[PDB]
Design a protein around this ligand. Structure first.
Ligand code: NAP
Ligand code: NAP
Ligand code: MG
Ligand code: MG
Lengths: 286, 286
């Protein structure tokens, strides 16, 4: 373990988010001091307020889960917002972290910022080797620049700043809105609406609490500069995923290469059919 | 002419620079109000001071020539500075410009931010189609993100923001320091040191006052979203360039595709051997 979190003060930016809240849940267990700021009190695109907040609380560890995220229609109609919000969050936090000597920093990239036609399964060195997908190019540019700005700080100063590249996420605090772009909630939604009515391609899915655990594992064991994929490893088809969904409700590619994270001795622990059913029931309970 | 500069208030950021000062010189002729801020009074990486300066002077046109520039050794040893300084300048100015409705904005890209192995001559759609040159990747990432952030504002809001992609520049206020990375001053320097001592591959070169004129031409006639190369068009070899240099002192690829700027009716006017000799003499006068 290159670094222990116990005793450190950790800032979890975007703690109300899907990823951020999962990191907070994993962190309630550790022996540390957690530090949060609601979106309503601290806009992380504001460089002044962000620097004073970092320079005052002086955390040892920044985990950047604050972001502007959305489906394809939002990305394509609000590119300036998706580029600026995400890029200014990362620049203001990475620069603030470098100025005061923050010991560790975690920036979050994404599977959808690799080149659109990169060979599958996607290794981390596929980054920037070809054209971006146009529909979320603006989001991707923001996440890549933050990643590269973290890399340059590690290069020039030895700042221990790293980027994780997650994949599609599911689990607690997911989006079940009828306008969600998350295929998995949408299936749980559409299949449940069918069973109660009574009327009658490969993909990856990662549980958010596995992602949270992997993010802490990287913080404790990963010292490299290059980014690290956090994938599911167990894939499934839209057809097979449909069967797994309709077979819990009662109703009648995009693959990452995870060699790097596995060489650090991490692999997701929650099974798809196990996490799905746990998500089906608590959608009902509400 | 889609837009006239006469009557408008134009901010020339980085007016002390090599490009910026040339734009100022071209602008002294126009009927406009020029607005400058010395680097010493306004750090354009500071979002707060930059917004208050834009929101107070309220220019109609922002020309962004402020930047952090250097040769290969600086780029490779100070990547974080070359990424952050340039990216924060562009983000703070583009966002400030969008917030108050700045009618026109010019961001400057560069020839060295195309993929390292893109087919020559480099068309503007070669951007991001392959890996960057590692030595100035950090600079390039900054210039690309600014470019794409300008593009996204034009896309989402119709902000009339454009990027020009110049090539190697020479002319007034050039760098003749013995540590200059500019090959052309270095030859003028090395060849003059030889002639007074007495002891005895293709490239492009663009005159800075041609670049300045082309930048104003784009502002007046170019409404597109995509970037526009501003190249020399007349190329020359390191061997032939050497002959042209040693044949003024008395001593004994990287090519852009300029179709787009030529379809706007612009082509550089200053001849290499004419601008060189004009630069040889005024180096002596000092
Ligand atoms: N396929 C993939 O690779 C993949 C998929 C999903 C996520 N991820 C990664 O995880 C990241 C987070 O995604 P998510 O699903 O957790 O998103 P999310 O649920 O929408 O969370 C965004 C969080 O950031 C906060 N926030 C937004 N703008 C802010 C601002 N200007 N200042 C401060 N806080 C602000 C939000 O606050 P509010 O409470 O105001 O909403 C919320 O807490 C993504 O950006 C991506 O890097 C990767
Ligand atoms: N091959 C190519 O495509 C190529 C080649 C050359 C230039 N260009 C383009 O032209 C741009 C400008 O290059 P240049 O040769 O003119 O560079 P330069 O001579 O070094 O000018 C930089 C200017 O920006 C100012 N500045 C620097 N940091 C600042 C900050 N934080 N806040 C405010 N002002 C700041 C500098 O002020 P000081 O007075 O304090 O120095 C100077 O006025 C480049 O970035 C590039 O886009 C393209
Ligand atoms: Mg989140
Ligand atoms: Mg300049």
């Amino acid at each position: 373990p290159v670094y222990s979190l116990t005793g450190k003060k950790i800032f979890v930016a975007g703690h109300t988010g899907m990823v951020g809240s999962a990191i907070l849940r994993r962190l309630q267990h550790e022996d540390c001091d957690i530090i949060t700021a609601a979106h309503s009190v601290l806009d992380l695109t504001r460089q002044g307020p962000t620097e004073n907040f970092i320079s005052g609380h002086r955390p040892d560890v920044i985990i950047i889960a604050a972001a502007r995220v959305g489906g394809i229609l939002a990305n394509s109609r609000f590119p300036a917002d998706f580029l600026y919000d995400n890029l200014a969050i990362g620049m203001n936090l990475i620069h603030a972290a470098h100025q005061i000597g923050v010991e560790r920093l975690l920036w979050l990239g994404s599977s959808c910022i690799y080149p659109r036609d990169a060979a599958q399964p996607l290794t981390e060195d596929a980054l920037l080797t070809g054209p971006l997908e146009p529909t979320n190019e603006a989001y991707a540019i923001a996440k890549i620049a933050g990643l590269k700005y973290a890399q340059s700080c590690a290069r020039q100063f030895g700042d221990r700043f790293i980027t994780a590249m997650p994949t599609n996420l599911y689990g607690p605090n997911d989006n079940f809105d009828p306008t969600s772009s998350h295929v998995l909630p949408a299936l749980i939604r559409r299949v449940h609406e069918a069973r109660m009515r009574g009327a009658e391609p490969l993909r990856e899915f990662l549980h958010v609490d596995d992602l949270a655990d992997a993010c802490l594992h990287l913080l404790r064991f990963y010292n490299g500069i290059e980014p690290v994929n956090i994938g599911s490893g167990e894939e499934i088809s839209i057809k097979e995923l449909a069967l797994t969904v309709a077979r819990i409700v009662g109703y009648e590619r995009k693959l990452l290469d995870t060699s790097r994270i596995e060489a650090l001795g991490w692999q997701p622990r929650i099974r798809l059919e196990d996490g799905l059913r746990d998500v089906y029931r608590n959608w009902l309970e509400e």
